[PDB]
Amino acid sequence: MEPHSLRYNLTVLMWDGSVQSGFLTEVHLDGQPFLRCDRQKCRAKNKTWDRETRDLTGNGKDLRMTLAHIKDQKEGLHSLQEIRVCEIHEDNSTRSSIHFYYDGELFLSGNLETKEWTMPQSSRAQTLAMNVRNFWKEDAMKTKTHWHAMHADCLQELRRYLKSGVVLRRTVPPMVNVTRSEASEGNITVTCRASGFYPWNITLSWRQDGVSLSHDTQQWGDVLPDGNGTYQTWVATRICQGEEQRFTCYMEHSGNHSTHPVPS
Amino acid sequence: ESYCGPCPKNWICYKNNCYQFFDESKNWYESQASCMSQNASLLKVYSKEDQDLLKLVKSYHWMGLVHIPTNGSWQWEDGSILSPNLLTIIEMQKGDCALYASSFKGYIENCSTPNTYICMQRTV
Amino acid sequence: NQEVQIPLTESYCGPCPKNWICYKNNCYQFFDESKNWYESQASCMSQNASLLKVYSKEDQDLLKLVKSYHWMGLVHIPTNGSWQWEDGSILSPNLLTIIEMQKGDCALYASSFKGYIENCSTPNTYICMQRTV
């Protein structure tokens, strides 16, 4: 099981030096879209989206003011983004970071576990980084405490969401179907399909007499989204006619080992 | 003095000035009108010492500071000049109105953009 | 009679220390000298006051607009798990959202009606409060 994740993606915009009234926050829960919020409201995909609305509107305002301390380009569209993610792992240990993007490029990162700020090396990443850290120094009460509270905010919100039981990581085990085709030159192709499965991680390969065939003696489907929240893949190999009973499709998914022979 | 006042019942008193904060977002004009309707005006900043509580205000709010065409200077609703070394003014959005923020900052906004706002009665 | 807001309906805000914020029969003051919770508690008591108690969203609605984090008068009880104020009052049911931030037996106030748990020994700004008799 992958960890439980919470992301907040905040975007402010500038046209010809002028910071726009709008800002957009995308909230994602366990990687799935969960909320879209503008200046006025959050919306799902009831009106107890008040908490998220009061909160994420404050951050938008702070980031409107932060952008105002960046007047390097009075020409064109420009974006500033504040992205905070936290995770709860299976061991019950936690991850938490915050990243700033300008025109879609990263310039400042903060790991909230280890209290460690990181810059990229480009002269551009650094002028933006410092601009912002300076604005923070400027009596803007960006105390050590602010960041430790953001950390514990993201994690507490995650717990609250998890507890309301909103997005389940339910297992959906694959439907498997072996097929035969290209009956020629005393040669057959056998194909093993797995479809309708979650989660995405799956093992699927042909065996001769219980031994896995090399990767190279085997053709490989990608792992495609089914377009209903699940996945499909396949794997195939060429065998001599009359050797069918020696060849089996072996699959592991979510602690379930299964073997599928070539139907006669 | 042990007593702070005269103020409306239910207004914040500090050094005999009276304040109230409003969360219903309004443009500068609707904001100014609302304050005056309660025998007040938008926040005027005349003193770092007497209005030192403004350092602990979160977020940005309409104050009563307006820019005049062929003026270049900023002035209050009441026609007062803005006193020097009280506020740092920052360009944020093109406009002729200013949001208050900590610490003694004015952020320029379009007068038409809805925002939270602070009323103050002058005790003069 | 009805809410008019004219000079005739103006009162004075009940007795407080000189130069404190008076609002709805409460007195508040903010202190920018960083101190641990104990030095903070002692400082408030030295001015015949206590640390911030939060008992009402309506009566203490000014606390929604407070920047940054400050010692309030909330202390942890070992036996059960629950919090209580300096004065022995229970913490009322739906007033504060409490966030585990650091392991500790004291709480920092932050807007909007949040308590962040911190180590009682960590220096912080603080808010004193006195009820007007």
CATH classification at residue A134: 3.30.500.10
Its domain, for residue A213, covers: 175-261
Contact C37, C106 (CB under 8 A): yes
Can you tell me the distance from the alpha carbon of A110 to that of A124, in angstroms, rounded to the nearest whole number?
18
Cβ(B92)–Cβ(B108) under 8 Å?
A: yes
- Please tell me the distance from the alpha carbon of residue C15 to that of residue B2, in angstroms, as a whole number: 5
Residue with tokens 């514990």: A152
C32-38's contacts with Cβ under 8 Å and 24+ in sequence apart are C32/C125, C33/C125, C34/C123, C34/C124, C34/C125, C35/C71, C35/C123, C35/C124, C35/C126, C36/C120, C36/C121, C36/C122, C36/C123, C36/C124, C37/C71, C37/C75, C37/C106, C37/C120, C37/C121, C37/C124, C38/C120
Strands C97-100 and C114-118: parallel
The method of structure determination was X-ray
Give the gap in angstroms from C-alpha A19 to the nearest C-alpha of chain B: 5
Closest Cβ–Cβ partner in A141, A143, A148 for C101: A148
Spatial distance between the Cα atoms of A86 and A112, rounded to a whole number of angstroms: 9
Find the distance separating the first CA and the last CA of chain B, reported in whole Å.
Answer: 17
Q: What is the 3-state secondary structure (H, E, C) of A169-209?
A: CCCECCEEEEEEEEEECCEEEEEEEEEEEECCCCEEEEEEC
- Count structural domains, chain A: 2
> Which of A111, A131, A164 finishes a domain?
A164
| CA distances in angstroms from C98 to A84, A102, A152, C93, C115, listed in the order given | 20, 34, 10, 11, 5
> Are residues A154 and A198 both part of a single domain?
no
Give a yes or no: residue A170 inside a domain. Answer: no
**Whole-number CA gyration radius for chain A:** 26
Q: Is residue A169 part of a domain?
A: no
Q: Which chains touch A (3 or more CB pairs under 8 A)?
A: B, C
CA A105/CA B124 separation, integer angstroms: 52
- Residues 6 or more apart whose CB falls under 8 angstroms from that of A91 comprise none
Whether A141 contacts chain B with CB within 8 A: yes
- Domain end, chosen from A140, A164, A188, is at A164
Q: A83 and A30, same structural domain?
A: yes
Q: In this complex, which of C6, C10, C66 lies closest to B7 when CB atoms are compared? A: C10
B89: left (phi over 0), alpha (psi -120 to 50) or beta: beta
Please give, rounded to a whole number of angstroms, the shortest distance from the CA of B2 to a CA of chain A.
Answer: 31
Would you call B39 and C6 a contact, using CB atoms and an 8 Å cutoff? yes
Which CA distances in Å does C62 have to A133, B60, C92, C100? Answer: 29, 15, 19, 24
For residue B13, the chain C residues in CB contact (below 8 A) are 13, 21-23
Specified resolution (Å): 2.8
Yes or no, beta carbons of B5 and C17 under 8 Å apart? no
Peptide bond into A181 cis (omega under 30): no
Interchain pair B1, C17: CB under 8 A: no
Q: Tell me whether the omega of the peptide bond preceding residue C112 falls within 30 degrees of 0, making it cis.
A: yes
Specify the amino acid at residue C124.
N
Report the candidate in C84, C83, C86 with the shortest Cα–Cα distance to residue C38. C86
Report how far residue A39's alpha carbon sits from residue A23's, in angstroms, rounded to the nearest whole number.
6
